[PDB]
Design a protein around this ligand. Sequence first.
Ligand SMILES: Cc1cc2nc3c(=O)[nH]c(=O)nc-3n(C[C@H](O)[C@H](O)[C@H](O)COP(=O)(O)OP(=O)(O)OC[C@H]3O[C@@H](n4cnc5c(N)ncnc54)[C@H](O)[C@@H]3O)c2cc1C
Ligand SMILES: CC(=O)c1ccc[n+]([C@@H]2O[C@H](COP(=O)([O-])OP(=O)([O-])OC[C@H]3O[C@@H](n4cnc5c(N)ncnc54)[C@H](OP(=O)([O-])[O-])[C@@H]3O)[C@@H](O)[C@H]2O)c1
Ligand SMILES: [Cl-]
Length: 531
Amino acid sequence: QPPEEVDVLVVGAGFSGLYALYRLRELGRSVHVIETAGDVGGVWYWNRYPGARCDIESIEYCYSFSEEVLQEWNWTERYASQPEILRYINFVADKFDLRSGITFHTTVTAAAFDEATNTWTVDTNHGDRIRARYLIMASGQLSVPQLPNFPGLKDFAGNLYHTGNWPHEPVDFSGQRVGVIGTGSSGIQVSPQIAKQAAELFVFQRTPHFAVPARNAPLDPEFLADLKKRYAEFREESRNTPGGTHRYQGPKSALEVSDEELVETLERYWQEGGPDILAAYRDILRDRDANERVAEFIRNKIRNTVRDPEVAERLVPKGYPFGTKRLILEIDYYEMFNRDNVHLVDTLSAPIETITPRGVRTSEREYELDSLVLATGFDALTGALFKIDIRGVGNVALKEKWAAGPRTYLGLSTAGFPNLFFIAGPGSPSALSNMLVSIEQHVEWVTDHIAYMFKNGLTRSEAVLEKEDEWVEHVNEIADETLYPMTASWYTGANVPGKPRVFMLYVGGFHRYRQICDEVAAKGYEGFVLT
Ligand SMILES: Cc1cc2nc3c(=O)[nH]c(=O)nc-3n(C[C@H](O)[C@H](O)[C@H](O)COP(=O)(O)OP(=O)(O)OC[C@H]3O[C@@H](n4cnc5c(N)ncnc54)[C@H](O)[C@@H]3O)c2cc1C
Ligand SMILES: CC(=O)c1ccc[n+]([C@@H]2O[C@H](COP(=O)([O-])OP(=O)([O-])OC[C@H]3O[C@@H](n4cnc5c(N)ncnc54)[C@H](OP(=O)([O-])[O-])[C@@H]3O)[C@@H](O)[C@H]2O)c1
Ligand SMILES: [Cl-]
């Protein structure tokens, strides 16, 4: 039930929005959060599908801002399941009395900057009108589900799900003919759970994605209690890294090594599981020949996982460099295809023509299904923003200004839109880092910036157009030194039809980006104009 006026309005109650609330209060600022969902958690509230699990270690993917949380919470598994992460979020939410600062079931429709008085007016689908000095869009990176692009969807006779909008009551696939469309992280995690229940599971794969064993395991309770002795320290080590974790930064070039040392080295990562293999060698995302030797080793591990050679071959990713679509952690996913009741439908060879009342037609034949699961992803990074009529100076639409790709200074603001801040979004490290590291830094940087504005008695903060252009050009420029922009992924907006193909993230590493933000604030916010 939202206030008519506030210092800062926050959109979204997932990790980012909750923390922004907590810190803004500590800083003696009035602050409120609007959230479409029924409750806190963001991705961990919405993504409730069976198998949903973090692929950053529970010990790294957690808040560090509170010593008490660090000491009191007990993680249980190398990689936390979604129910567990949702209990942690509730634990924190509870601990700091956060819900009192949040309006649920409410979706922000539009926001417009008022130049006369230097404020945002912010409307919602319940007619709430809030005036705020600052607007923080804590509204996610992977928060607006994307349906795939083919017809007959509303004609399907059975039940229809998207993993990103999963039912609050467990879904029963027992005895069903089930289809999953999509084999990114969502579909990889969800499929082996549905394989346990369905009479027949059909996995509709388009481009195969690279996946490596998670090797999840219980967490040793002693290791935990040790870790806690120096938790603050351990976390500060994670902030001083490109990826926001303890990942080893392999110093060698993947080209300098024999085939023999290369295999022995990747074999050790493969038996160990997890994503650290992405940094086995310094140049894997930088040099196509280096990349390829690593990609080959992975593809061969893939072939060897599946008994039938033809099914095995269709599982092998082709045509793009390893790691350039987000790396996936799998758990019994490749093994699944050895089962009698699991069918890999290769839609590259036979593309989907349409959905029918009965199920799915490809160019080669029709599949009958009782249920269809869409693991088809998200209109990423800009999708949630673009859903909101956001309006800056001269009445510029954010959606129009960014229609060729997101334009920002430090990913934190855009020229022409003063008092507006984007948490962990395009133009910053964002999902290229452990997101809790990217999220805590952006929250602390924005909220300090806000507090600094108040201290000094100002009320207007605007990214300077020339710095914005300079920043966007720098982002593209350093991306272009890597293999990232070369591949169609949601990072480059490739999954939404008509969306501009532009790599959206800052690739220079969390550490450098935090250093660059720190010198910006240390000079009273170079590249902003403050009045
Ligand atoms: C299934 C899934 C698994 C993930 N696993 C990991 C992982 O292992 N490691 C990792 O580092 N990151 C991973 N993440 C990335 C995840 O985006 C971040 O880690 C972190 O959860 C993002 O937090 P957030 O608060 O920025 O956004 P979100 O958690 O997305 O919260 C955004 C909230 O804003 C609300 N919202 C949006 N628009 C409006 C509006 N118009 N009005 C009102 N409310 C609105 C949404 O409903 C949502 O609740 C994963 C993401 C997905 C989708
Ligand atoms: C932490 C963790 O383990 C976890 C778990 C879950 C999510 N996450 C995080 O969220 C991000 C998104 O992952 P996701 O799986 O939900 O989404 P995706 O990666 O966008 O894959 C979409 C898939 O659907 C297929 N596809 C799309 N359109 C299609 C079409 N029109 N016709 C037919 N098929 C279509 C598309 O095919 P192709 O050829 O690759 O476009 C692909 O197979 C992740 O990267 C993590 O950041 C993390
Ligand atoms: Cl992720």
